[PDB]
Amino acid sequence: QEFLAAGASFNQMVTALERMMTSQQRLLSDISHELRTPLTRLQLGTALLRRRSGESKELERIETEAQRLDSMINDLLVMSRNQQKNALVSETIKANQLWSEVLDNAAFEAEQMGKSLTVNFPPGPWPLYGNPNALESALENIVRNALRYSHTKIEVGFAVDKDGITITVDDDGPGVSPEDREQIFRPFYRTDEARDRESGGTGLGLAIVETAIQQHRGWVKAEDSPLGGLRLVIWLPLYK
Amino acid sequence: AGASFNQMVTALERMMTSQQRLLSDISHELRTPLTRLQLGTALLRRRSGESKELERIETEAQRLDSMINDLLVSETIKANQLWSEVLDNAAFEAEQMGKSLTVNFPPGPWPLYGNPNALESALENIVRNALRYSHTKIEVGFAVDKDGITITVDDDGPGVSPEDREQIFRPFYRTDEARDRTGLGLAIVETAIQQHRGWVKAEDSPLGGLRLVIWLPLYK
Ligand SMILES: Nc1ncnc2c1ncn2[C@@H]1O[C@H](COP(=O)(O)OP(=O)(O)OP(=O)(O)O)[C@@H](O)[C@H]1O
Ligand SMILES: Nc1ncnc2c1ncn2[C@@H]1O[C@H](COP(=O)(O)OP(=O)(O)OP(=O)(O)O)[C@@H](O)[C@H]1O
């Protein structure tokens, strides 16, 4: 329930939260899997139709939309594989252990593109409670996005407080129109500029991030970056 | 620690409702391209009239419509109502693949009690796997008894090594043989059948390929 809360300790509560999420995830991967077959048949139907009556504006529309669904579903299952490839068990972890590998790899990666990665303040031994892999992925996705869309530089900044950790990621690349700053976290949502880019697919990254982070009782925000591009702010509570 | 009771409450609400919100958002996003897909068939039916193919497209679109709708949110059934569409569609698909599908004995009006969709997917996955891995032929056979229904599926394709016959039902697992040419199919099957107090098994097939046997209990 998580409403296991009538009586229970915080830890027990989250395990009940972990129990629910896994079934929600089983549901999503089972439906994702099962959507593929009628879809397969539909495509055999269009194919057979194109053979009998040839190309059409209408048929072309049906075929491209069927391909959109096909693609989304494929990406949904790729995701499902990864989130269940993660065991979920929530544990106490120090911020530095949790994200140092991620940041070091990002420095290596930034260096290859010829770009620069700068850590304004590194993470310390600050206590968190959660799924280590999930929070790691949250940060690699935010920084990999930054490395990709940046023009020359990336910046990462940690901040600690009696209350929590605040992670800030910045890039000097193109921004995100103010309207889209709310929308970028919706699933399958990409900006017209990344659709013009025409590279990559999926718009799950930030949807996965927002979900994980809310599940970890924190929050995420997209803003104008002082470097001129995009700013991502993660806040997570301390565990005591 | 510093937080207001209100901040606690919102943190808590958002925390429990995030996956729900995620799934309902995924559902919304799949629904819009689908809505367009349905007007393409509609506009096409306007332009070029009825066709078997157009009918096919339309019903498949109505199925997608229903399952995406599930993302947002046991009964008594007769085996024949439960699985005939699964089988008819398996026949449609088989004809296109250039393969042959044979039903040695069809299901009758045999009482079952469970989730119709779960059991449908259970059978559909077993025969559709058989259409995939088969070389030329597939055979489906029903059997009834005072106790239950036993569905047997056979193919003439490559088999599965005896060691792997237990593993293939594990989720996200595929044999190394299949890895040269998702792995939820037989996991979905095992789950639904076990949930209906039945069982699933992989064996040697008389056709030379793989044999899958589903047993489900009858209803009182
Ligand atoms: N650093 C960035 N600068 C500008 N826009 C960005 C940046 N990162 C993301 N966006 C915009 O927000 C969208 C959401 O991206 P998100 O990570 O959710 O999916 P994605 O990066 O497109 O694909 P993937 O799922 O493979 O990461 C992106 O397509 C892009 O349009
Ligand atoms: N009829 C068959 N003949 C031979 N091998 C099979 C047969 N059915 C399943 N297998 C093997 O067992 C594995 C389990 O398949 P399962 O249905 O669980 O996933 P899948 O069919 O590979 O993928 P999907 O989930 O998309 O159907 C397959 O990858 C395949 O190696």
Residue numbers in the entry:
A (entry chain A): 216 to 455
B (entry chain B): 221 to 293, 305 to 412, 417 to 455
What did the publication describing this PDB structure actually write?
Here we report crystal structures of the full cytoplasmic region of CpxA, a prototypical HK involved in Escherichia coli response to envelope stress. The full cytoplasmic region of E. coli CpxA (CpxAHDC), encompassing the HAMP signaling domain (residues 188–237) and the DHp and CA domains of the catalytic core (residues 238–457), has been produced as recombinant protein for structural studies. The CpxAHDC structure consists of a homodimer, in which the HAMP and DHp domains from both subunits assemble into an elongated central coiled-coil region flanked on either side by the two CA domains.
In some crystal forms, however, only the C-terminal α2 helix from both monomers could be traced in the electron density maps, because CpxAHDC has a tendency to establish interactions via its central-core helices, leading to the formation of dimers-of-dimers that sterically interfere with the positioning of helix α1. When considering together all CpxAHDC crystal structures, it transpires that the DHp helical bending promotes a strikingly different dynamic behavior of the two CA domains in the homodimer, primarily due to distinct interactions with the central four-helix bundle. Thus, whereas one CA domain (from subunit A) is retained in a fixed—inactive—conformation close to the DHp helices (α2 from subunit B and α3 from subunit A) through a relatively large contact interface (∼1,200 Å2), the other CA domain with apparent unrestrained mobility adopts disparate orientations and displays significantly smaller CA–DHp surface contact areas, the largest of which (∼800 Å2) corresponds to the autophosphorylating Michaelis complex (see below). Instead, the active site formed by the second, mobile CA domain is poised for catalysis in three independent structures crystallized in two distinct crystal forms (trigonal and hexagonal space groups), with the ATP γ-P and the acceptor His248 Nε atom well positioned for the phosphotransfer reaction to proceed. The catalytic cores (DHp + CA domains) are very similar to each other in the three independent crystal structures; they can be superimposed with r.m.s.d. of 0.9–1.4 Å and display an identical network of hydrogen bonding interactions involving key functional residues for ATP binding and catalysis. This highly conserved active site geometry in distinct crystalline environments emphasizes the stability of the CA–DHp interface in the Michaelis complex and lends further support to its functional relevance.
